[PDB]
Symmetry: D2
Amino acid sequence: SARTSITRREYDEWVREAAALGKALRYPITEKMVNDSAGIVFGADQYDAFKNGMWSGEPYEAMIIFESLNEPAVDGLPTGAAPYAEYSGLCDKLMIVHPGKFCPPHHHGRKTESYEVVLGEMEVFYSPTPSAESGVELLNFSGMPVGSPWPEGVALPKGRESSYEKLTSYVRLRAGDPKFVMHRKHLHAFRCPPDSDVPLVVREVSTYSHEPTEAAAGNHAPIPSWLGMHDNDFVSDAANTGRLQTAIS
Amino acid sequence: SARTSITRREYDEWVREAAALGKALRYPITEKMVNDSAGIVFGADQYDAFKNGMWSGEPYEAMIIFESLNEPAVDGLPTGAAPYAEYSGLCDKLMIVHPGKFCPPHHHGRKTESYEVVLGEMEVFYSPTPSAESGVELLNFSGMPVGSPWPEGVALPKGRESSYEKLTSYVRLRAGDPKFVMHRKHLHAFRCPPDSDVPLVVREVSTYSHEPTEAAAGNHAPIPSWLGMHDNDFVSDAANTGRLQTAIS
Amino acid sequence: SARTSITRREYDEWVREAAALGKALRYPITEKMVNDSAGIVFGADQYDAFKNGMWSGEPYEAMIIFESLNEPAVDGLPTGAAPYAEYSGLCDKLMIVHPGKFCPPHHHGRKTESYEVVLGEMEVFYSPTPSAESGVELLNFSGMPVGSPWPEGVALPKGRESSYEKLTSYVRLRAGDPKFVMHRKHLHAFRCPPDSDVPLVVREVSTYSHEPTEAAAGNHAPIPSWLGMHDNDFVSDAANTGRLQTAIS
Amino acid sequence: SARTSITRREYDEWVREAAALGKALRYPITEKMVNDSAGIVFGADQYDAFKNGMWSGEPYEAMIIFESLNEPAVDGLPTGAAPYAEYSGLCDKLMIVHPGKFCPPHHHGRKTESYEVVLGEMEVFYSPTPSAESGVELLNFSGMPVGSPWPEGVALPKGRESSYEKLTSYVRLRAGDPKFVMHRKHLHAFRCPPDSDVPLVVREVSTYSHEPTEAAAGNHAPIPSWLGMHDNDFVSDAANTGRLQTAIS
Ligand SMILES: OC[C@@H](O)[C@@H](O)[C@@H](O)CO
Ligand SMILES: OC[C@@H](O)[C@@H](O)[C@@H](O)CO
Ligand SMILES: OC[C@@H](O)[C@@H](O)[C@@H](O)CO
Ligand SMILES: OC[C@@H](O)[C@@H](O)[C@@H](O)CO
Ligand SMILES: OC[C@@H](O)[C@@H](O)[C@@H](O)CO
Ligand SMILES: OC[C@@H](O)[C@@H](O)[C@@H](O)CO
Ligand SMILES: OC[C@@H](O)[C@@H](O)[C@@H](O)CO
Ligand SMILES: OC[C@@H](O)[C@@H](O)[C@@H](O)CO
Ligand SMILES: [Co+2]
Ligand SMILES: [Co+2]
Ligand SMILES: [Co+2]
Ligand SMILES: [Co+2]
């Protein structure tokens, strides 16, 4: 009886309600942003989130993302910056995570993120040290803060527990807090507390998002190399696959 | 009788009211963001904006900016990207422009911006072609849209009219519109319509802001060259000076 | 296969999501307000709204109401006003109507309402003349405006069409409009346009709400007569019954 | 040098900024609501609030009120209720109080109020017992809660201190709290804490407001007696006068 997809009704009610919530919070959500790629389920065994639904409070890895901007920022750059442009760009999106649900452990080789909680509270789990990239020297300036240890009783998705092992640093973000920076090459994940009366709504402002997803499969590449380039590295292999497509029956 | 500064009372009422407006619109404004550098007057002859005040509707070049993020995004970058990092980074700020007032004509060599109107309407004036940088090849991808001609009856600041000559393209942005990208090297300016019942409030998401201002004079430089580096080029010379400091009597 | 109740999952996702939307729009929703009486289905044949769900856009009579205040306002009144107190009082609630759905035709003998659209648009159908109450003279001051005729193509609930016959006056309300008064004794109904991208959210400020509902069955009566007193008169008999209780399986 | 009026510039910047704040918080403010009666100064010696301004934090009695509704609710009432209609009606308004400022001690013979804090925090001072009205029996149901004693260090307006003597009960209201009822005949006053970073914004839902003010001098009376009827009883005589008119030079 393990779900393997989400019904069209479950998908729409989930995504359309989320888009309305976004508008209420003044996020500029256009029609094109409300599509079949906005609702994400990280892996086949994560569809079980829809057995009891998004308000069950159960630990599953799924979320909604409404992307309002993913600008390469390639125009006006000196030609020499061509091979390093992929680390820049501007990506603005609204992320909605229901109680107990998670944006699973992963890291980006090029994308640096920043978080602004709009509604609810965000519990971020991360590795304070970056992932070492063999054979390449990396610049350093502020690094990541050590943060605090995890609070007790954090329910993790069944069969995904170990993927969180290395994300020992923890921080709870709220509306009004200083913007929070998640440097590239750092493992990170986050969830909405299970006892939350509202979905976690977060505004993410980051560098360009390289993702040959479903809603982004057919566009033009600003720079040759960018073509097909992937910048998502999920700790759990089950997460990497289902990320680029949601099975809607 | 030409004003040469702004009284402490005029400054505070202007900036503190704006910060409250920002909070109401859910922008994460912290205490440190509400400072003596947030309220900007572009040039000595622009202080006359305070003869009749911010609700007079008169054409002057002055605005408020509450910066919530100006992240270099240098961490995790390969060393080779060092000389091109200045074109990246993440800068999030809230800008408040009162009726009739303007963010004066200028362009950035490195910073690419994007606009999201939160309240009111934004009238953007810009040059659809970038400024040619002698002796250097530049990348290209989307360029800037031609836009529309200026509507009639746009009152410009006295003695600043000609600075707008080259910003022939025009567009009026509203809340809910697609994010608007202003590529680096493009001349641009914007104002809040004079008949607006509310101040124009805009969320700007751009690449790093290189500005050795008053509230940013003493920090650490992520990369050597960044030190003292300026990235603001106002068409009117009077604007470049008063930009980095507000005279509060 | 005609639904006869709503599953606990359908109920919670419907009501809890609505409460979150309410909070985002700054309505003061407390825990006690989010209960099993907030989600209303007007009649047994209206449960079919949940065959395709609240985002189907189909015409059904169901809505959500989060009541933040229902103050008798009896304290401090001269004893003589006792028999007329039932026409006063203060009731503040947030109403959420999904696309295509309706608050069915009905009128109140004592309650006068006022509407403020917070999100979406509200299409009100009403009778510009009050219902004559046999053997009693009534005061008059402003009466109700004639309004406009119905726009074409308004899909009404199957088997409930005729209940709308007398509500010939029509008006479409939006956020920012002047408060709209619906005097007592006037037939009225309203819906969220079927093509709306967001649920209709309306703040109602009215006189006391006399309703021996499920969440209001056991309180104390400020005045003797008020006990058991009913003030809802739905045109369709099917609506009056299911109003005071929602079948949650 | 004691101010005796408010300049047109001080008035407009105060009221127009407040109206913008109101809109941001989604209060339906129309053009007609933004008038010369919205900004209130309670007495000649209260104009000194404008010596240092609304952000000085100093204790003065002045506030802004944007009334969106003041419905008699007389239509549909049985003729017998005519002499008691004045205790009913529906009045919806947004009140804005700057740091340290107060809505001065007063009570209403007919109007019962309810408070909903939208922004900031509201400190209410009141008398838990109603004012006895000689020769008339009054109904009772819930009465007023005893509340808590005043916190220490509450700066009161100079020369108005004693007017607060009897308002010994205290409560601090915040956004999201249950609606707060202030029954008619109860002395009450409230202020925005002096250390607040934002103005106190409160939505008031009450029974009809009988006030032959400046913006309400020339309308039609729903009931004969209502004509000229006053329902404001300020403890300080200086407050009653300046209430109905603001001196704008
Ligand atoms: O799938 C997650 C998506 O790519 C988000 O924008 C960020 O990485 C979450 O950290
Ligand atoms: O102001 C700094 C902020 O609170 C966080 O510590 C950093 O963004 C983490 O990268
Ligand atoms: O002084 C203007 C400031 O630098 C702003 O962030 C942008 O450039 C306006 O286009
Ligand atoms: O969606 C594109 C947007 O409306 C504007 O045309 C561009 O951002 C301009 O750069
Ligand atoms: O069931 C409807 C409820 O009683 C509402 O508050 C109003 O009457 C709708 O007009
Ligand atoms: O301002 C009046 C408003 O627009 C409506 O016409 C009335 O409230 C209807 O009762
Ligand atoms: O002048 C105060 C005004 O009348 C307000 O609506 C309430 O009474 C304040 O309690
Ligand atoms: O819920 C009751 C509320 O908190 C206040 O105690 C009353 O309205 C006071 O009248
Ligand atoms: Co990420
Ligand atoms: Co610029
Ligand atoms: Co009704
Ligand atoms: Co009062």
